[PDB]
């Protein structure tokens, strides 16, 4: 039995290994690794094909479809999506997800030197713009949320000039570095960790908020979803997932 594994280029979870290499031979990261462990525990062969608009998946209601690694996978193109792929309600309608096998929050990175000191202090002011991944799981949380504050978050976010909306994790980490403080990122705290250690003119507002989880997805009623997800928790029990996580987020 061979899966298509569909994921997207990003530290530290998957990308192009230095060549001073074919197959998967060709990428590392975190997802590389787990997917391999895996591999192992729940005896499976695997091809890595990572997708070519790299993005997450969301769904574009002008046009009523979906993008990214849960595209791949409601057309069956692919059998596995990994990455740091939240689960999110829309997402959950159209695929499904194993068991998490990463818990995280919410979190504001900011250019040190900042003086905001929580995401209400955040939102009750406009010297600095802040915003997300654009349509990514931070500005689901913000958008679906009934929350007063959050509600200000995100009517904000929609109304900066110039668009507050980034592609990625690193084109936000950029623009915080770039703009020397009047532009705040919120990003999942996984991935602000990851950056915060690797930049030292960069340090996180405020404390973690939301509770949200890194799931592998896969197509609906799938019959490897549970040989997956028992995979997942065996790695889990046994310490590997700490001792991965540790690997590839451990550090100004
Ligand atoms: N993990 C998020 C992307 C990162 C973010 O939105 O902060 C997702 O699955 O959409």
Same mark, same amino acid.
Not at 28 to 51: H, R, S, T, W
Not at 132 to 146: L, P
Not at 176 to 191: D, I, P, Q, R
């Given at each position: ?66 993008? @990214? ?40 990175? $900011?250019?040190? @030197? ?18 997300? +991944? ?46 020397? @403080? ?22 996180? +507002?405020?404390?973690?908020? @939301?509770?949200?989880?890194?799931? +592998? ?18 790695? $889990? ?16």
């Amino acid at each position: 039995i061979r899966y298509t594994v569909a994921t997207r280029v990003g530290k530290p979870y998957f990308s192009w290994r230095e060549e001073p290499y074919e197959g998967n031979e060709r990428f590392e990261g975190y997802a590389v690794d787990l997917i391999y462990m895996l591999a192992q525990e729940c005896k499976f062969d695997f091809n890595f094909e990572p997708v070519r608009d790299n993005k997450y998946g969301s769904y574009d209601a002008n046009t009523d479809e979906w993008d @990214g690694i849960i595209r791949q996978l409601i057309d069956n193109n692919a059998q596995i999506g990994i990455c740091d792929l939240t689960i999110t309600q829309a997402r959950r309608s159209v695929v499904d997800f194993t068991v998490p096998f990463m818990q995280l929050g919410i979190s504001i990175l $900011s250019y040190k @030197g900042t003086d905001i000191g929580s995401l209400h202090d955040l939102v009750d002011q406009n010297k600095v713009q802040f915003g997300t +991944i654009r349509g990514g799981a931070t500005s689901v949380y913000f958008s679906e949320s009934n929350d007063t504050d959050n509600r200000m978050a995100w009517n904000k976010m929609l109304s900066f000039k110039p668009d507050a909306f980034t592609k990625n994790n690193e084109e936000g980490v950029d623009r915080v570095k770039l703009s020397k @403080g009047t532009y705040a990122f919120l990003m999942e705290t996984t991935n602000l960790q990851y950056y915060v250690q690797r930049n030292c003119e960069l340090t996180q +507002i405020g404390e973690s908020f @939301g509770e949200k989880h890194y799931g +592998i997805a896969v197509p609906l009623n799938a019959d490897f979803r549970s040989n997956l997800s028992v995979g997942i928790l065996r790695l $889990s029990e046994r310490g590997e997932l700490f001792k991965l996580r540790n690997k590839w987020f451990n550090s100004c």
